[PDB]
Amino acid sequence: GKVYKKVELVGTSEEGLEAAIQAALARARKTLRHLDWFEVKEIRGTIGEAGVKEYQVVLEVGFRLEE
Amino acid sequence: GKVYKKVELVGTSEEGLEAAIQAALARARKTLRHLDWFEVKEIRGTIGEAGVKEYQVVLEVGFRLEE
Amino acid sequence: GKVYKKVELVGTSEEGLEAAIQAALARARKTLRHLDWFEVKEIRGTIGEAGVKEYQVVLEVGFRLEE
Amino acid sequence: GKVYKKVELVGTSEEGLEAAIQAALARARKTLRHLDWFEVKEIRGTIGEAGVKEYQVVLEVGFRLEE
Amino acid sequence: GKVYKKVELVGTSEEGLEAAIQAALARARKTLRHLDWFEVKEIRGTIGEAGVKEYQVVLEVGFRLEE
Amino acid sequence: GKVYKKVELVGTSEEGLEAAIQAALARARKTLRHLDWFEVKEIRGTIGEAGVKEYQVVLEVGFRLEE
Amino acid sequence: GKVYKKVELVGTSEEGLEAAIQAALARARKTLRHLDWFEVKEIRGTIGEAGVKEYQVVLEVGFRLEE
Amino acid sequence: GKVYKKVELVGTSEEGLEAAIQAALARARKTLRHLDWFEVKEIRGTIGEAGVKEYQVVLEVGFRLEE
Amino acid sequence: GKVYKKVELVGTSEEGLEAAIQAALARARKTLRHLDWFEVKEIRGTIGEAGVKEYQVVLEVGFRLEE
Amino acid sequence: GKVYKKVELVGTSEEGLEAAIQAALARARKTLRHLDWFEVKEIRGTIGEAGVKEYQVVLEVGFRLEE
Amino acid sequence: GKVYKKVELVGTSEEGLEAAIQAALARARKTLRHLDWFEVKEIRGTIGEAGVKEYQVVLEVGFRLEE
Amino acid sequence: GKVYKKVELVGTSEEGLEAAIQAALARARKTLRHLDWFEVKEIRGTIGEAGVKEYQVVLEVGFRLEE
Numbered sequence: 001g002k003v004y005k006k007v008e009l010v011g012t013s014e015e016g017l018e019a020a021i022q023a024a025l026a027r028a029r030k031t032l033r034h035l036d037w038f039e040v041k042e043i044r045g046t047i048g049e050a051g052v053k054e055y056q057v058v059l060e061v062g063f064r065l066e067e
Numbered sequence: 068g069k070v071y072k073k074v075e076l077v078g079t080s081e082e083g084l085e086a087a088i089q090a091a092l093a094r095a096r097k098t099l100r101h102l103d104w105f106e107v108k109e110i111r112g113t114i115g116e117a118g119v120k121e122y123q124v125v126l127e128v129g130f131r132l133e134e
Numbered sequence: 135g136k137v138y139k140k141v142e143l144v145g146t147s148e149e150g151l152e153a154a155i156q157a158a159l160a161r162a163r164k165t166l167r168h169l170d171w172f173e174v175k176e177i178r179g180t181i182g183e184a185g186v187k188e189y190q191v192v193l194e195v196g197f198r199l200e201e
Numbered sequence: 202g203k204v205y206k207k208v209e210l211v212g213t214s215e216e217g218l219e220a221a222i223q224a225a226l227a228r229a230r231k232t233l234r235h236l237d238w239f240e241v242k243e244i245r246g247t248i249g250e251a252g253v254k255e256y257q258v259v260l261e262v263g264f265r266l267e268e
Numbered sequence: 269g270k271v272y273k274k275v276e277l278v279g280t281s282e283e284g285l286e287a288a289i290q291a292a293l294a295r296a297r298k299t300l301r302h303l304d305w306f307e308v309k310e311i312r313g314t315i316g317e318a319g320v321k322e323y324q325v326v327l328e329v330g331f332r333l334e335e
Numbered sequence: 336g337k338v339y340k341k342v343e344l345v346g347t348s349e350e351g352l353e354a355a356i357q358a359a360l361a362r363a364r365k366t367l368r369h370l371d372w373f374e375v376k377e378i379r380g381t382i383g384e385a386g387v388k389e390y391q392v393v394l395e396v397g398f399r400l401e402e
Numbered sequence: 403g404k405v406y407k408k409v410e411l412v413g414t415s416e417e418g419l420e421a422a423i424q425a426a427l428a429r430a431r432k433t434l435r436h437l438d439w440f441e442v443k444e445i446r447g448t449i450g451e452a453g454v455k456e457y458q459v460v461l462e463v464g465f466r467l468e469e
Numbered sequence: 470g471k472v473y474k475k476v477e478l479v480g481t482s483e484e485g486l487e488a489a490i491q492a493a494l495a496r497a498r499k500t501l502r503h504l505d506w507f508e509v510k511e512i513r514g515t516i517g518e519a520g521v522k523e524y525q526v527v528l529e530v531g532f533r534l535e536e
Numbered sequence: 537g538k539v540y541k542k543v544e545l546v547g548t549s550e551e552g553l554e555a556a557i558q559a560a561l562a563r564a565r566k567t568l569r570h571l572d573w574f575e576v577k578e579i580r581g582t583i584g585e586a587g588v589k590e591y592q593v594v595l596e597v598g599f600r601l602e603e
Numbered sequence: 604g605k606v607y608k609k610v611e612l613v614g615t616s617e618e619g620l621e622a623a624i625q626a627a628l629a630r631a632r633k634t635l636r637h638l639d640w641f642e643v644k645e646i647r648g649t650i651g652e653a654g655v656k657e658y659q660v661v662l663e664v665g666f667r668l669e670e
Numbered sequence: 671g672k673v674y675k676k677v678e679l680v681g682t683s684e685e686g687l688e689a690a691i692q693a694a695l696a697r698a699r700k701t702l703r704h705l706d707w708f709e710v711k712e713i714r715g716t717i718g719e720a721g722v723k724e725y726q727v728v729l730e731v732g733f734r735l736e737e
Numbered sequence: 738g739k740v741y742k743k744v745e746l747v748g749t750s751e752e753g754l755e756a757a758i759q760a761a762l763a764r765a766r767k768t769l770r771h772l773d774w775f776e777v778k779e780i781r782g783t784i785g786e787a788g789v790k791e792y793q794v795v796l797e798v799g800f801r802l803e804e
């Protein structure tokens with residue numbers, strides 16, 4: 001009946017984990033419709049002078065295909 | 068030489084597992100050419116009053132890239 | 135806000151995979167309320183004289199906790 | 202000597218990841234005694250108009266069995 | 269005391285998943301004795317014009333070694 | 336037909352691995368009926384002055400559900 | 403801030419593993435901009451009369467999304 | 470140069486884990502030559518009136534192929 | 537050319553996940569130079585009377601080796 | 604319909620990874636018919652005075668069963 | 671607050687599994703302070719004329735870092 | 738009896754995979770004694786204008802502890 005597609009995005013943020021996830025989802029929303037669920041695959045990031053520099057949440061986003 | 072792409076789809080069906088897989092592949096065939104193989108990643112679904120409500124087969128579909 | 139619980143069941147059937155899943159969900163329904171989704175963890179079984187004897191679907195069942 | 206049990210819960214929250222984990226543990230505390238440790242199995246969630254709608258932390262909770 | 273061996277087979281069928289599993293077990297029975305249990309490792313297949321062309325169930329078969 | 340449930344326990348012992356497994360199964364037997372099989376998921380433990388202090392075997396226990 | 407996308411390709415070559423990876427990346431470069439990193443997921447291949455016939459490197463390619 | 474083969478066996482014993490492993494290796498030694506190393510894949514078993522009934526160590530055994 | 541080393545740390549914090557990661561990286565920075573990236577392996581923790589007591593992020597830290 | 608068997612071999616070579624894989628397949632070819640595909644499970648090896656001493660590619664080889 | 675380090679050791683013994691684990695922890699204790707917990711990653715070993723020759727337990731050891 | 742330690746290194750090279758592994762092992766040899774075996778955990782790398790820029794082999798190196 002219904003068919004969904006999953007797309008793997010990496011959301012990044014210097015503020016936090018929630019912000020990194022939201023960054024990815026805010027970009028998906030600009031282009032994709034019927035965004036339904038997400039799955040966090042891994043949490044990575046870079047290290048700077050002040051500790052964590054950039055949080056990087058690797059993310060699978062599922063959306064319903066039209067037509 | 069050849070390069071293939073894999074795309075992750077979720078086929079759903081109220082009838083059965085085979086029907087769920089076929090639903091995903093029937094939607095892929097509308098848009099993609101040179102579909103070659105698939106790999107079932109996981110089997111999930113929803114529960115209703117009569118037991119299984121919707122079978123949901125998470126699926127990787129491999130196809131040959133042109134040019 | 136909401137909290138769900140997951141419970142690991144193994145549904146068995148001599149007839150097929152769908153029947154094995156349905157057996158587990160039919161038993162869960164007798165006792166548990168607000169059954170929402172399931173996840174197939176593995177498919178196993180026994181072998182007899184006529185091939186497959188019993189299909190055994192190891193299954194995670196998610197339901198909403200009350201109150 | 203001692204025997205512990207592990208139970209798989211899914212804590213949900215619209216506010217954040219920490220709130221989702223706390224939701225699950227607050228519900229466990231109402232019913233279970235000698236809660237000791239937890240293990241995050243996966244982080245999932247739903248998508249709405251404003252990005253993340255509901256954070257969902259799938260969680261294993263370990264507690265000491267009495268007697 | 270007892271020692272079992274596991275052998276990895278791939279059963280294929282154009283008709284369905286159950287038929288693929290049965291194809292592997294029917295071939296094992298021709299040659300091996302004391303076949304006891306099986307474990308499905310992965311589900312793959314090929315794609316044709318009519319959707320799924322051949323279902324391919326990768327399968328571990330366990331049997332008791334004699335003597 | 337039949338439906339089984341799996342429950343995740345952690346047996347602990349200062350004496351050894353076998354004693355840790357037996358501790359979990361001895362506690363299960365007090366409360367659960369038709370215990371059939373177990374699966375070791377992981378082996379952990381604590382460290383003291385004399386080496387290993389407590390062996391901790393994380394364990395899945397499968398039993399047949401009644402009625 | 404930044405958002406990356408990951409795409410799963412399978413590079414193939416009769417010459418070697420490096421050539422298979424390079425095949426996939428050369429095809430990505432024709433169409434995608436800001437290609438940054440790759441991750442080898444698995445190495446497979448076909449067998450002919452002279453041993454290995456075609457090396458097949460399944461590959462995840464990460465690139466920065468524009469705008 | 471050298472080629473090794475791996476074979477998956479399941480050693481069982483009512484006495485203990487070490488005895489289960491040794492049961493598998495004692496049977497391998499009767500038939501196979503140049504046995505070099507082993508890898509424990511999982512530890513399972515059955516449950517009886519007195520706790521553990523039979524320990525079952527699933528095992529990969531590596532040996533050098535002749536010629 | 538370049539060689540990096542990875543070290544596995546567990547950062548802990550009573551405040552949150554981000555604080556737990558930062559605690560680990562702040563300790564690494566005291567002793568190690570050329571810290572570049574991190575990978576979260578798992579998220580665990582302890583439970584107290586107020587829910588989560590201590591967040592524990594198991595973490596791999598990668599840094600470039602000198603000379 | 605068709606049934607395939609998978610066999611786990613370890614090909615070794617002092618010259619390189621491709622040579623290690625080819626060593627395994629060249630030995631399989633001597634004894635087995637209808638060799639079709641392979642899957643690299645892991646890459647290991649030994650260390651000597653001059654760096655890598657022996658590359659060791661653990662390999663699954665799939666072939667069609669006759670008759 | 672607190673930061674722990676994990677180190678991966680392989681304890682070996684001809685006597686048994688418990689002895690292999692203890693061998694690793696006895697060596698760690700000579701050099702490292704505040705050893706707290708361990709995690710068994712895998713169980714391997716070598717094969718001789720009399721069956722198992724050497725048990726080899728690959729082990730992660732966690733200890734609290736000072737100051 | 739014997740105790741080994743494992744250390745996780747990432748060897749990099751612009752020339753190839755073998756060169757990346759050798760880079761890691763050549764650096765280990767400068768400082769560590771009784772290097773015995775290695776295990777490749779993952780293969781990653783960076784992308785430049787000419788395809789692959791730097792191969793990066795994440796590697797576990799095992800060596801016998803002295804004394």
Ligand SMILES: CC(C)(COP(=O)(O)OP(=O)(O)OC[C@H]1O[C@@H](n2cnc3c(N)ncnc32)[C@H](O)[C@@H]1OP(=O)(O)O)[C@@H](O)C(=O)NCCC(=O)NCCS
Pocket residue numbers: 031032033034035063064065066072132407409411429430433434467
């Ligand atoms: C390049 C790329 C990142 C740009 O992404 P993007 O900005 O989201 O662009 P897309 O065209 O993919 O956007 C979605 C499209 O599907 C439509 N769409 C949105 N929601 C949809 C839905 N739920 N179902 C079906 N179609 C949908 C949109 O209308 C849009 O189509 P449009 O041309 O009418 O505007 C992206 O297209 C990509 O990575 N695709 C694959 C590229 C690739 O891997 N190449 C192969 C190299 S070997």
Ligand SMILES: CC(C)(COP(=O)(O)OP(=O)(O)OC[C@H]1O[C@@H](n2cnc3c(N)ncnc32)[C@H](O)[C@@H]1OP(=O)(O)O)[C@@H](O)C(=O)NCCC(=O)NCCS
Pocket residue numbers: 005007009027028029031032065098099100101130131132133134407467
């Ligand atoms: C949105 C989406 C789901 C729509 O699905 P769809 O029905 O397949 O629509 P598409 O436009 O992708 O159709 C397939 C395209 O692939 C092409 N194609 C099919 N098979 C091909 C092959 N073997 N080789 C090369 N191209 C091929 C088709 O010709 C078509 O392109 P065209 O419009 O130039 O003729 C899909 O485009 C997509 O996932 N893109 C979004 C990716 C994404 O997540 N973007 C980033 C968001 S932040």
Ligand SMILES: CC(C)(COP(=O)(O)OP(=O)(O)OC[C@H]1O[C@@H](n2cnc3c(N)ncnc32)[C@H](O)[C@@H]1OP(=O)(O)O)[C@@H](O)C(=O)NCCC(=O)NCCS
Pocket residue numbers: 299300301302331332333334474534608610612630631632634635668
């Ligand atoms: C090639 C192969 C698929 C042949 O399949 P097959 O049709 O089942 O043929 P078999 O040789 O296994 O015949 C069955 C054998 O198992 C024995 N057997 C059956 N049940 C048994 C049991 N429960 N306990 C012990 N032996 C049993 C039979 O007696 C027979 O042995 P026999 O020839 O001494 O009489 C399979 O044997 C194989 O893949 N061999 C290994 C190939 C390999 O890996 N090569 C080395 C690496 S290159």
Ligand SMILES: CC(C)(COP(=O)(O)OP(=O)(O)OC[C@H]1O[C@@H](n2cnc3c(N)ncnc32)[C@H](O)[C@@H]1OP(=O)(O)O)[C@@H](O)C(=O)NCCC(=O)NCCS
Pocket residue numbers: 005065072074076094095098099132432433434435436465466467468
């Ligand atoms: C078939 C497919 C692989 C072909 O890819 P391709 O030929 O290499 O190139 P595409 O046309 O998809 O992508 C190139 C586009 O991405 C853009 N792109 C490249 N780098 C980009 C970047 N970093 N950021 C945003 N966009 C980028 C290019 O400018 C181009 O866009 P434009 O032509 O609209 O200006 C691709 O269309 C695809 O797989 N899409 C998804 C198909 C799918 O899953 N279908 C659903 C079936 S159910």
Ligand SMILES: CC(C)(COP(=O)(O)OP(=O)(O)OC[C@H]1O[C@@H](n2cnc3c(N)ncnc32)[C@H](O)[C@@H]1OP(=O)(O)O)[C@@H](O)C(=O)NCCC(=O)NCCS
Pocket residue numbers: 273474476478496497498500501534634635636637666667668669
């Ligand atoms: C011992 C062993 C390594 C020998 O390897 P080998 O050099 O390849 O010898 P094989 O017996 O496997 O040779 C292949 C056999 O199967 C046949 N065979 C080859 N290709 C075949 C195919 N595509 N389909 C069916 N059979 C095939 C060959 O003709 C040969 O049979 P034959 O001797 O009856 O002529 C291997 O047979 C083996 O691992 N056996 C199992 C050992 C084991 O684990 N048993 C339990 C001990 S605890």
Ligand SMILES: CC(C)(COP(=O)(O)OP(=O)(O)OC[C@H]1O[C@@H](n2cnc3c(N)ncnc32)[C@H](O)[C@@H]1OP(=O)(O)O)[C@@H](O)C(=O)NCCC(=O)NCCS
Pocket residue numbers: 273275277295296299300333500501502503532533534535608
């Ligand atoms: C059933 C089974 C476990 C019993 O086999 P077994 O008791 O170990 O005896 P096998 O003959 O197979 O293997 C031992 C033989 O290998 C040979 N051998 C031993 N080690 C060897 C090695 N290192 N290299 C090459 N040959 C070796 C020996 O000569 C010995 O006796 P042989 O002269 O008859 O060949 C085994 O035959 C089997 O599982 N085969 C595969 C079954 C299968 O999956 N086939 C397809 C069915 S769908």
Ligand SMILES: CC(C)(COP(=O)(O)OP(=O)(O)OC[C@H]1O[C@@H](n2cnc3c(N)ncnc32)[C@H](O)[C@@H]1OP(=O)(O)O)[C@@H](O)C(=O)NCCC(=O)NCCS
Pocket residue numbers: 567568569570599600601602603675677679697698701702735742
């Ligand atoms: C004990 C321990 C936790 C303390 O960690 P620590 O505070 O970082 O102490 P270190 O010994 O690593 O000191 C850091 C050293 O690394 C050096 N270093 C830092 N960055 C470096 C870089 N990027 N390249 C090369 N060297 C570097 C520093 O210069 C310093 O060297 P110094 O002694 O010349 O001043 C840690 O040393 C340890 O776990 N070592 C291994 C213990 C072990 O497992 N042994 C076997 C037990 S069985």
Ligand SMILES: CC(C)(COP(=O)(O)OP(=O)(O)OC[C@H]1O[C@@H](n2cnc3c(N)ncnc32)[C@H](O)[C@@H]1OP(=O)(O)O)[C@@H](O)C(=O)NCCC(=O)NCCS
Pocket residue numbers: 541543544545563564567568601675735768769770771800801802803
């Ligand atoms: C920074 C670092 C990589 C430098 O590595 P390095 O170049 O190999 O230098 P090291 O001093 O650690 O290693 C060589 C030492 O190990 C010894 N060694 C070599 N082989 C040995 C063996 N098999 N058994 C015991 N010791 C051995 C050498 O003799 C030498 O000791 P010595 O200088 O006292 O004579 C290393 O200090 C490190 O990674 N430490 C851990 C970092 C860490 O996790 N710290 C905690 C931060 S929060």
Ligand SMILES: CC(C)(COP(=O)(O)OP(=O)(O)OC[C@H]1O[C@@H](n2cnc3c(N)ncnc32)[C@H](O)[C@@H]1OP(=O)(O)O)[C@H](O)C(=O)NCCC(=O)NCCS
Pocket residue numbers: 541601701702703704733734735736742744746764765768769
């Ligand atoms: C060779 C090696 C195994 C020797 O192990 P070792 O027996 O523990 O010897 P170390 O020198 O590390 O001694 C342990 C140190 O940890 C310190 N220490 C012990 N417990 C501690 C704790 N919990 N917190 C902080 N420091 C602690 C000890 O005091 C000692 O340091 P000190 O002698 O300077 O006072 C070495 O430590 C090692 O594995 N280092 C890694 C080197 C490496 O990776 N090489 C680069 C590869 S290219």
Ligand SMILES: Cc1cc2nc3c(=O)[nH]c(=O)nc-3n(C[C@H](O)[C@H](O)[C@H](O)COP(=O)(O)O)c2cc1C
Pocket residue numbers: 002004034036037038062064077111123125245246247257
């Ligand atoms: C394979 C798959 C995984 C899903 N995972 C989740 C989950 O992570 N959490 C959740 O709330 N919903 C999950 N969903 C349910 C989807 O959000 C569901 O499709 C949506 O609620 C209704 O679908 P629709 O787009 O047809 O309206 C999942 C659905 C599928 C197909």
Ligand SMILES: Cc1cc2nc3c(=O)[nH]c(=O)nc-3n(C[C@H](O)[C@H](O)[C@H](O)COP(=O)(O)O)c2cc1C
Pocket residue numbers: 069071101103104105129131312313314324412446458460
């Ligand atoms: C990584 C990968 C995985 C594949 N898996 C399968 C498989 O699951 N089953 C199968 O029959 N063929 C499998 N194939 C073979 C493809 O179907 C093959 O590319 C096709 O048969 C011929 O390729 P073509 O598109 O160039 O004609 C696989 C190929 C690749 C690249």
Ligand SMILES: Cc1cc2nc3c(=O)[nH]c(=O)nc-3n(C[C@H](O)[C@H](O)[C@H](O)COP(=O)(O)O)c2cc1C
Pocket residue numbers: 203205235237238239263265345379391393580581582592
């Ligand atoms: C298998 C297992 C896993 C554990 N994991 C953790 C951990 O994640 N973090 C932690 O602080 N304690 C962990 N613990 C320690 C428990 O919290 C421990 O049982 C408790 O601190 C003391 O036990 P008690 O209930 O008998 O008082 C673990 C214990 C077991 C049995």
Ligand SMILES: Cc1cc2nc3c(=O)[nH]c(=O)nc-3n(C[C@H](O)[C@H](O)[C@H](O)COP(=O)(O)O)c2cc1C
Pocket residue numbers: 178179180190270272302304305306330332479513525527
């Ligand atoms: C490691 C292993 C896995 C097994 N898994 C299953 C299972 O998937 N389902 C099942 O019904 N029996 C399973 N069994 C039980 C076997 O079927 C059992 O050996 C058989 O019922 C009785 O053994 P026998 O050949 O000595 O008569 C398993 C046994 C072992 C050794």
Ligand SMILES: Cc1cc2nc3c(=O)[nH]c(=O)nc-3n(C[C@H](O)[C@H](O)[C@H](O)COP(=O)(O)O)c2cc1C
Pocket residue numbers: 010044056058404406436438439440464466781782783793
């Ligand atoms: C999740 C993720 C994984 C990455 N893995 C690697 C790695 O495998 N090796 C590497 O050199 N760089 C890796 N990078 C770093 C990227 O190459 C990095 O984004 C690039 O060097 C700079 O990003 P830019 O496109 O914004 O300039 C990774 C980055 C992300 C987001």
Ligand SMILES: Cc1cc2nc3c(=O)[nH]c(=O)nc-3n(C[C@H](O)[C@H](O)[C@H](O)COP(=O)(O)O)c2cc1C
Pocket residue numbers: 471473503505506507531533613647659661714715716726
């Ligand atoms: C992939 C593979 C895995 C191995 N694992 C181990 C191990 O677990 N422990 C060990 O002591 N030796 C291990 N070895 C080393 C073998 O025992 C080695 O082949 C033997 O010591 C010497 O080989 P030979 O049969 O040619 O004499 C391994 C070898 C290979 C090929």
